[PDB]
Design a protein around this ligand. Structure first.
Ligand SMILES: Nc1ncc2c(n1)-c1ccccc1[C@H](c1ccccc1)C2
Length: 285
């Protein structure tokens, strides 16, 4: 792997710890990184390190490289899991990212369901934060393509952070109209044109954000309950959309439905979503 001194972090200053996440598609561990904050050269920072599993394939390696490279191009933002460094030379590839102690959002919400609970303000704030992260991502010309509650992480101070940039691309790096394009996107979060037309734009992410909203307001509900993946797209072509979640206003549901407009250009932009959610959150608070 080519040297990138700006991002390179010393292996001797990194102490690997306990496993994080389910570990299906990569190996992620908690770690202590000494001096990773360059203003505090002697302070250990609790980080997350992504690396290859023992059963990794050649494609796993080139995917992990591409994910790291993608995260290099995305500047710092509070509502995004940011790259902190990498160990690339003379050993196994470690991709060092921000640690979020409270795990993924789906589990986070499911665990605080009533049999401290989420308030309505908590849920709108969560939605607002993610709209902001996605607004920033889109401004960086990045399409995420895998927006979902499982791919949002939450910190100790309850900050929502978009994670998992394995499917993320620069907007110009999509092989348009090729039958393989978007073949690896989870179908239940996926805009119809991503499959039907083999394209992916920022407006495709907007659809997924609608799904994510539904997840949030159902406190980690599973989309399209009782509908198998195999029959979803016929139903979507026929105009099927998910019903309003109980603990969510008509206004917020109308926002979800807007996100699920059949016509991509008729969906809101992330900019507009941020503005509307800002207004709602302000009035709620
Ligand atoms: N609790 C927790 N904090 C941080 C991460 C993960 N889990 C986690 C758990 C499983 C998979 C991924 C991740 C995250 C990730 C994001 C982007 C690149 C590399 C790692 C890092």
């Amino acid at each position: 792997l080519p040297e990138d001194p700006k991002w390179e972090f010393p292996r001797d200053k990194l102490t690997l710890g306990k496993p994080l996440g389910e570990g299906c598609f990569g190996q992620v561990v908690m770690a202590e990184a000494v001096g990773i904050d360059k203003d505090k050269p002697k302070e250990a920072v609790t980080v997350a390190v992504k690396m290859l599993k023992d059963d990794a394939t050649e494609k796993d390696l080139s995917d992990l490289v591409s994910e790291m490279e993608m995260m290099k191009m995305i500047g710092k933002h509070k509502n995004i899991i940011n790259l902190l460094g990498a160990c690339t030379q003379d050993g196994p590839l470690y991709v060092i990212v921000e640690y979020a102690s409270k795990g993924n959002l789906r589990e986070y919400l499911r665990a605080r369901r009533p049999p401290e609970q989420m308030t309505f303000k908590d849920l709108v704030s969560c939605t607002y934060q993610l709209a902001r992260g996605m607004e920033y991502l889109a401004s960086q010309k990045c399409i995420h393509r895998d927006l979902a509650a499982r791919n949002v992480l939450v910190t100790e101070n309850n900050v929502m952070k978009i994670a998992d940039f394995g499917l993320a691309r620069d907007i110009n790096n999509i092989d348009y109209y090729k039958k393989t394009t978007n073949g690896r996107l989870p179908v239940k979060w996926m805009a119809p044109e991503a499959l039907f037309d083999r394209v992916y734009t920022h407006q495709s992410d907007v659809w997924s954000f609608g799904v994510l909203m539904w997840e949030i307001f159902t406190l980690g509900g599973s989309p399209y309950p009782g509908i198998p993946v195999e029959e979803l797209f016929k139903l979507l072509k026929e105009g099927h959309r998910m019903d309003k979640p109980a603990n969510c206003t008509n206004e917020l549901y109308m926002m979800m439905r807007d996100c699920w407009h059949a016509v991509p250009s008729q969906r809101p932009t992330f900019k507009q979503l941020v503005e509307d959610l800002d207004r709602i959150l302000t009035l709620t608070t």
